[PDB]
Amino acid sequence: LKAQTKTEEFDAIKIALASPDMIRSWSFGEVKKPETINYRTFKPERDGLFCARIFGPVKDYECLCGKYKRLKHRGVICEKCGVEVTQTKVRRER
Amino acid sequence: RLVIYEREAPEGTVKDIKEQEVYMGEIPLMTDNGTFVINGTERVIVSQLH
Amino acid sequence: VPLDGGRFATSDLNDLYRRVINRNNRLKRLLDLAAPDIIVRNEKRMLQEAVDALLDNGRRGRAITGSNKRPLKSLADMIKGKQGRFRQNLLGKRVDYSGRSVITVGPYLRLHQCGLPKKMALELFKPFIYGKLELRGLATTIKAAKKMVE
Amino acid sequence: GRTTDPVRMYMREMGTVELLTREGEIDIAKRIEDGINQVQCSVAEYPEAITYLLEQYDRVEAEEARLSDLITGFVDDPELAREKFAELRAQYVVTRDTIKATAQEEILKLSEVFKQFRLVPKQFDYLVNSMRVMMDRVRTQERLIMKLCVEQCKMPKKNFITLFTGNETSDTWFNAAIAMNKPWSEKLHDVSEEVHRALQKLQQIEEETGLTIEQVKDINRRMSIGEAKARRAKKEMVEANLRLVISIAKKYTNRGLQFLDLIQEGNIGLMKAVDKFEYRRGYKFSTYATWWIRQAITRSIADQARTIRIPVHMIETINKLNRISRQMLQEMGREPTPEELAERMLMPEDKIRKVLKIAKEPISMETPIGDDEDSHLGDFIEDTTLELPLDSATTESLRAATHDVLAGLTAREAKVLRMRFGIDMNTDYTLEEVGKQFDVTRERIRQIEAKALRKLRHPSRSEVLRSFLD
Amino acid sequence: TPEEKLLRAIFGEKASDVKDSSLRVPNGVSGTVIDVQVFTRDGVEKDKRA
Ligand SMILES: [Zn+2]
């Protein structure tokens, strides 16, 4: 049978040195600015330590600017500010 | 009291403005029972030994 | 994340990361501005210091957090934890379905049993109680069951 | 030795440079002048440099771009500009026709009038870059043609450059030197195609830049020399004055940026000061640069050092309150009431709340609370965002409630009610659309719903669901 | 969500724009109210009970 592709049970954790490319793997974007939040509307400043574009939407299944707020549109990256609409839990992951 | 000494001594002042009592902070008071009240609460400062 | 009184709260990693980012950018700019060597060197050194403070603080000058004397907790300290040596899976963890109270005698007991306070048993088995309740049909829906034991 | 802290590293590394003698300041500034203006003259000697300015101004009077983008000032108004530019075009059209031993006099003047223009930094840089890029192309063809002889067809570089220099376009060096009956001569018959196809672009550049390859190299090369001189002198100046930067940065110390940060942004300030300075105005460079450094410092500070960045003017506006807060401090007894400040300011008086709120820096999530333990404040922040389990239970059940109750309605009543809402289906459907998929539209469909609800209103279909609303 | 959309549609319940923040008696403790205090911000209109 084919070995596997994606999530299944696991064993045997390995640890080793990181490579620039291996680092660029887990990274879904580069934070270019020290900014965090807008200071008025507490929404994340794009390309900052807190960012919806790079990391994740503030509220579940709702894009930042709000073009797609519906649970229907999920695997869609927004045109305005690219934020794919998915659980805010992925802001703990990415 | 703020004294401004005229430069080139003997020391004597051009003007010394003696300001009236200037309020710096308020300080806690001790009850007849030997307690202090910080916020609506009786508090005690334990004597230190060193 | 927010807090009462409109105030905020945040990890020290943000202070650190912020420093590293800022200095890095400043270095890029100084490169484009063709700054003299002494400056680009000083900057590179500072960046090394910052990155260090981020990874593990205290092998270096021990940076302090914004408007606070206490040294900012670095990533190494995020891992190591504290209270001797444990990371969250040893020293302890908070656990659901549990309780406690003062203990009493109960000589009438049999060695295989113990007196459990009524309210306690109510609160502990609350999820099971819901289930049985609407299992027999004494409750319309789970909500109603909650209202029943409430 | 090095005490490891970068403060001392920089402190000593800089203290190795001597203070500039009052003569040396003028000497260095002079060197600067020599260099820069040299690169400028190098720009003016480029034909395409002039042509570009013309081609852009054509777009300026064509409303395809503004003047502010193409220039700021001449050496010294839209009409005055509209004429002065026509002067440039004039000197161009005269210098252009003499390109036939006479021209050497007028091409001097074309440069002068071009020098009368103060360009925009973006534009000037665009020109410089363009020049050196052209030279990169020239080099492309030069190295290409070179590697087809010495590296491939095996000819000495000694004999290669012999007839190569001075033409590098025509066949005087190529076709006339292949027949020479030399050892490296008869070897060139194989690559004769490639080189000859390569000469095309080489002769083409001469038509574009309007220069012979010879001249082309010389001009921007001399320019490079000039730029090098400039950066060298400038750097010398900056390195000389670092002590000043440090001295200034010491004032801004606890504002929330480290000593090294302050002296760095300030150092950038000093760099800028060395960029914009004119010694001809007799202004002391010290006191002149002081402003620039203090400027970069303040700007940087208020711009970054906060976790939550606040717009520039805002910080100032806060300070303005922090001012009058003090005068009334002991004078007023306790202090001026939260609503009695901004009367002294000019503004709606409400700003105090918001400004005084968003301002205060967030508390470290690691701030240890009582017990001194690892009980740090962050471990006490509860998650409200995640739904409690007792909820998801009820939702899981409401699925079953709505489904069971939708099992009792008729076929088209179930379909219409599920369709009207988003029940177990992607999005929902407009009441106009619900009939579009039913072939029976308008009021009819909107009726079946209104009746359906009625059926689910009374204590048969309405019972199980009733409890769900508390 | 659609389930609650249908639910609110059928039972005609306008979802309030406000959540209950009221201070409830701690669960399990029972006593008699002796005293009530109201501290109003300076400048905010005093309510009836105040
Ligand atoms: Zn969007």
UniProtKB/Swiss-Prot annotation, chain D:
The record marks 420 as: Interaction with anti-sigma factors. It comes from Escherichia coli (strain K12). The gene is rpoD. This is RNA polymerase sigma factor RpoD. Contains 4 domains, connected by flexible linkers. In the active conformation, the domains are in an extended conformation, each making extensive interactions with the RNA polymerase catalytic core. In the autoinhibited state, sigma-70 factor domain-1 packs closely together with sigma-70 factor domains-2 and -4, contrary to the extended conformation that is seen when the protein is part of the RNA polymerase holoenzyme. It is found in: Cytoplasm. Residues 405-458 are annotated as: Sigma-70 factor domain-4. GO terms for cellular component: cytosol; cytosolic DNA-directed RNA polymerase complex; sigma factor antagonist complex. The lineage of its organism: Bacteria, Pseudomonadati, Pseudomonadota, Gammaproteobacteria, Enterobacterales. Signal peptide: none annotated. Its main location: cytoplasm. Residues 237-307 are annotated as: Sigma-70 factor domain-2. Keywords: Cytoplasm, DNA-binding, Sigma factor, Transcription, Transcription regulation. The keyword Nucleus does not apply. Residues 316-392 are annotated as: Sigma-70 factor domain-3. Residues 431-450 bind DNA. GO terms for biological process: DNA-templated transcription initiation; negative regulation of DNA-templated transcription; regulation of DNA-templated transcription initiation; response to heat. Interacts transiently with the RNA polymerase catalytic core formed by RpoA, RpoB, RpoC and RpoZ (2 alpha, 1 beta, 1 beta' and 1 omega subunit) to form the RNA polymerase holoenzyme that can initiate transcription. Identified in a complex containing RpoD, the RNA polymerase subunits RpoA, RpoB and RpoZ, CRP and DNA. Interacts with Rsd; this prevents interaction with the RNA polymerase catalytic core and with promoter DNA, and as a consequence, promotes transcription from promoters that require alternative sigma factors. (Microbial infection) Interacts with Escherichia phage lambda antitermination protein Q. Sigma factors are initiation factors that promote the attachment of RNA polymerase to specific initiation sites and are then released. This sigma factor is the primary sigma factor during exponential growth. Preferentially transcribes genes associated with fast growth, such as ribosomal operons, other protein-synthesis related genes, rRNA- and tRNA-encoding genes and prfB.
